[PDB]
């Protein structure tokens, strides 16, 4: 389920957490202009650059942080709180997060193993409301 998958994506982080982030950045190509030097890019060319690499990296380490804090796929208000306050984030809003979990939950489905799609999509919604209530636009 919600927790063996954490560990799951947790094994191979940093391919999971690039090719999950191409297939958001490729369903939506209009969010690659707020990492502007990522627009008119090919996928092997963003993975050849660092910050591509290491910030899809620490993106994903957060939000594997907040999966493992998380009740019933429901985060910790304290968890929405801080992440409204990031240093440098202050213009990350809720509807980019939810295109975000839309390509993780059709990535997970496109895959042949047995994640719990279903609860990444619930964690997906539970993390835009929580993020909404704390303060996100
Ligand atoms: C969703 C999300 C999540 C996140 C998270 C995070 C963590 C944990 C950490 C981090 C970090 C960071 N960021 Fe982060 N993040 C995000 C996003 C983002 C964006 C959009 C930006 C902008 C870019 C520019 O260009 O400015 C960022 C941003 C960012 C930064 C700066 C940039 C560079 O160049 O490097 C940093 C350092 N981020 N981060
Ligand atoms: C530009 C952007 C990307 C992600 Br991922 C989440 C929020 C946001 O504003």
């Given amino acids: 389920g919600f927790k063996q998958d954490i560990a799951t994506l947790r094994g191979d982080l940093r391919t999971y957490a690039q090719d999950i982030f191409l297939a958001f950045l490729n369903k939506y190509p209009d969010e690659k202009r707020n990492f502007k030097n990522y627009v008119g890019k090919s996928d092997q060319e963003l993975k050849s650059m660092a910050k591509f690499g290491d910030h899809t990296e620490k993106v994903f380490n957060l939000m594997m942080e907040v999966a493992d804090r998380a009740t ?3 985060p910790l208000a304290s968890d ?11 213009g990350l809003t809720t509807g980019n997060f939810e295109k975000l979990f839309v390509a993780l939950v059709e990535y ?3 895959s042949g193993q047995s994640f719990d799609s279903q609860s990444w999509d619930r964690f997906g919604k ?3 409301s929580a993020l909404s209530s704390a303060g996100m636009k």
């Fill in 126 to 128: 539970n993390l835009v």
């Fill in 72 to 74: 019933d796929c429901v």
């Fill in 80 to 90: 929405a709180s801080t992440l409204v306050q990031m240093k440098q984030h202050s």
């Fill in 108 to 110: 997970m489905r496109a």
